Each structure stands twice: as C-alpha cells, then as structure tokens.
C-alpha cells in the first residue's frame, strides 16, 4: 500500500540546537516583528577545560502573526522548536 | 513591547515530526507512506561550500500510531527549512 | 599574563561525525584532495529509524605528500584531518 | 587513492570558522591558556546571529607558559600548542 505525501508551504517554523544550555539560560521573546533567542551560560567544565558560551539570534516573523500565537518547545535532546 | 514566548509541550497528542532539511531543495526530498510507516528520503549530490565540496543523504522511517489513516498524513516545509509531518488523531 | 601570537597554520579541518562509528568512516587522499566518506545503515533512534551518509572533499595545499596527511577521531566523535 | 589510517604535550584544536582573526584572542595567564572570541550580529540564512565564547585550559605540569604558540588554518581551525 503506497501513497505519496505532498509537501505544502507551511507556516514559520525553526529548529535550533541549544543542547549546551539549561532552560533558565535560554530566553525566547517576540520583539516587534522579530522572534529573538538569547542563550548564555557562565564558565562550566567540559572534557577539555572550562567553557562559557553566549549567542543571540533574531528571526524575522511573517506579516500576519499575532505574537501570542508564537510558540516554542524544547525537546529532551535540547532542540528548540519555534513556530507561528 | 517584548513578549516572552509560550512554551508548549513537545508532544501535541498526535503524530508529529519535525526535521531540519535546509540543505535540500523540495525536489530532493521525498515523503511517502508505505504500509504502516512514514518514510522520508533526502539527498543532494556534491555542491560547493565553505572549504570544498559536500554531498549528503539520509532516510528515516516512523511507524504510524495505531488507528491512523495513511491518507490523513500530510507534510509542510517552512520558509526556514523545517519539514513537518503530521496526521490527524482519528 | 601574556598575549600569544596566532600564526598562519597548515591545512587543518574539524568535522563533527558523532553519528558514525570509526568503522563507518573512511578517509582517503586522491591526488590533491582529501576525501571523507561516512555511512551508517538504518538504526533506531528517539522517534523512528534513521540512516545517514555524507561525502566531503577538501582541497590539499600544493605539494603535500599524500602519505603525510593525518587524521584522528576524538572520543567525542570529532574528526581532525591535518597536512602539516 | 591512498587510505589514511585514523603525554605531557599541550595540544588543542578549536573550530573558530565564525570569527575574523581579530575577533580571536589567545592568552597565557598563570598556568592557564585562555581563548576569547566574539562577533557582533550579522545576517545568517534566515535572520541574524551574534556569538561569543570563552575557554580556559590547564597547561600540563611539565610545560612552560612562555612556550605556548597558536595558529589558524585556512579552514578555520585554531590550534594551540606547547612542548615540555
């Protein structure tokens, strides 16, 4: 029993790897027409020595989006999904 | 003014799959239902990037949840290169 | 306290190949290119099954002895290839 | 085709491909080597990204601080080395 599934044009949706960061160390917010993602952790030991990291990303949202409709989920594997 | 984003669960109750396919054009990606499984195949031949050439390929299968109709399966591609595959609970 | 000078170094690449085991990776020198080939058969993971394969080519610097190129796989699954 | 095979010395490799050479700083401080890198927001595939990290490594007991050198490959790998 074989069917092809057509791939449609979908809404705003991004995947970000953030496995190095705890939930409290990651902030996702809507500012204006951008979704911002800020992530930061202070010095921490890994296998090599000590490491501290920080990034800031911005994604432009599409026109017809209510900010209260933007959602986010963090998989156990540390992948952040953001949709709108 | 800055609005903190609502943090839903990773599980929406029904069949749901998200995959990053930013390296592939739509024609290089194939989604099908075969028996009780959803298959996803993606491949691109060698292309230039940062310091030489790269070619990539993967294949994934997921068992549809019990009682789900294959015809109800759908997929979409976000502008940001995220492939979503879903089926209505049924 | 002392500033260490960063000099122009020799050919060196790092390649995350953590999804593959040492047996599932081959490195070879073909003329003036170093090639990486990696492949794994379908195996289970979090949500279903996955198989993966990639092929990469890096251009070597002029006049390098193909015997002198070296590679190493760290415990973390990062592949280092160098041609000093 | 030629198939390449896969102590108290200091040797590290870091992927710093995202940073200009003047955004990367390597210092010897006491018995530690420190690396700092930072770049401002720049466009990415679908938005903007800024990144920063700080790493500290412990020099092995039989290694002299003043001996530490560093190099950047054409492919964006920073190597930091020292001999006993």
């Amino acid at each position: 029993p074989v069917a092809q599934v057509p791939t449609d044009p979908g809404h705003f949706s991004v995947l970000l790897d953030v496995k190095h960061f705890s939930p409290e160390e990651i902030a996702v917010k809507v500012v204006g027409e951008h979704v911002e993602v800020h992530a930061r952790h202070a010095a921490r030991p890994d296998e090599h020595g000590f490491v501290a990291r920080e990034f800031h990303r911005r994604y432009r949202l599409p026109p017809g989006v209510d900010p209260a409709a933007v959602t986010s989920a963090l998989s156990p594997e540390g992948v952040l999904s953001i949709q709108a």
Side-chain angles (χ1 to χ4, degrees), chain A:
Chain A
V2 184
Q4 313 205 301
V5 182
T7 303
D8 300 310
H11 55 254
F12 183 90
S13 178
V14 309
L15 298 168
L16 278 96
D17 179 79
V18 293
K19 55 169 164 39
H20 296 136
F21 304 91
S22 277
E24 75 276 6
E25 298 181 331
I26 303 170
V28 184
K29 53 208 210 193
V30 186
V31 182
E33 288 244 21
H34 286 92
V35 170
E36 310 191 349
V37 186
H38 312 272
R40 171 193 173 260
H41 73 72
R44 239 168 47 179
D46 66 6
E47 38 279 293
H48 310 299
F50 282 79
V51 64
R53 300 173 178 100
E54 182 165 33
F55 74 80
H56 315 273
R57 305 201 70 112
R58 268 173 291 173
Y59 302 92
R60 176 70 181 269
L61 278 177
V65 170
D66 175 22
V70 179
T71 67
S72 94
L74 183 64
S75 73
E77 302 77 39
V79 175
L80 187 63
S81 164
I82 304 172
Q83 300 187 227

